[PDB]
Design a protein around this ligand. Sequence first.
Ligand SMILES: COc1ccc([C@@H]2N[C@@H](C)[C@@H](O)[C@H]2O)cc1
Length: 438
Amino acid sequence: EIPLKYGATNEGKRQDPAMQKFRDNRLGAFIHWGLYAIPGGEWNGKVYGGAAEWLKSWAKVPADEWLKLMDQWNPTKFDAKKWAKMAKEMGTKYVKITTKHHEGFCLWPSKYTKYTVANTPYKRDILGELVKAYNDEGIDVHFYFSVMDWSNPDYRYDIKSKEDSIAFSRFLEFTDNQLKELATRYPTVKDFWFDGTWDASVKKNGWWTAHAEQMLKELVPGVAINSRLRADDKGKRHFDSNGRLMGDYESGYERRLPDPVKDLKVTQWDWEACMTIPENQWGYHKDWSLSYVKTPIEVIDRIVHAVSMGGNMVVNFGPQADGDFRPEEKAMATAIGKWMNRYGKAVYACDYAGFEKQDWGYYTRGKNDEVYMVVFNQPYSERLIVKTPKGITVEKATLLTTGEDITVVETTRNEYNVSVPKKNPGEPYVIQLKVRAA
Ligand SMILES: COc1ccc([C@@H]2N[C@@H](C)[C@@H](O)[C@H]2O)cc1
């Protein structure tokens, strides 16, 4: 048992109302919007296949020159109420917003740097307007923040000297000032999601990560903080050197979700996956033909998969420079919202059901012991196998959308065949089980 000043703070899941709301939300959207939306992955006639929000790096653009993009920041089609409506229709319960990405351009009028929205033709506090607009739709708002900041010369990747070390303290101070500003200007914020905390400079200053979490929790009651912020005394990140989760929930599973058979350990803590629609574009990139683009059913599968394992899923959007959304993204949000509007009773406020995974899809459990079968792979057998845990029996099955009764047959001791519906629903669909325990 290694002793640590800056390791894990929670032991187990938070059960306060604010974390319960975080959890019960389940479905969110991510907004990556920044100066990178203007060049859209293209610099001086070259289209880069890398993530558009890292274009500064790929095209080796100097900061002075990258930040001059502020002169072009004027999203005349931007309308916060329209964004909030789109989110509401999609069925999202929260939105995570890049307040500042690695480039260091702030979407709120920070007084601690001139690289902000206030110094652009558009002038307006984009972040403030989104906060209000989402909140008026009853949508929670979470703040992405990049500690790594390519706009501030005090930033260091490592500390190799007194001069580094001095510069970096000033950088941490600046960072604290920005975070305080965010927390006080936008007091309805429910979460800070840190990024760009993997450099040796940050790993060598875990104390700062614990301080940042504490400071923010003091300023914003109930706020959630992600694991990626956090490094312990030994520089170990996400989980401390005793294997205990730091922050309030695990943030990962960006490429791959936990395996539904081998990774059941995740059910023991809150966690949240965030995904891109293309393979790896978060900011707006003009050419989506460069990588595979997920269809709505692929995305819905991922959303349900996360909830079936006690996790939230967040779907990313990279708005256009003009302040509108590209057609693929509007289509995606609409598809998802139609599906959520028929089947969201099996997503919202649901969790791990404790049933052995089957090939036809996923189980989720409702707040009142409902067990939902979410079918993504329709068996030619027309039989959906359900293997119950010891002492559990299935008393009824019902098609969620129509209420029709669905036949359940016991095949052996802890096992049933739940028939598919009389008419193929033609999309992923839900059957609700009434189950009874000894
Ligand atoms: C493997 O290196 C990285 C570094 C930064 C990222 C950033 N985290 C995502 C959520 C976006 O903000 C992306 O640019 C992704 C991968």
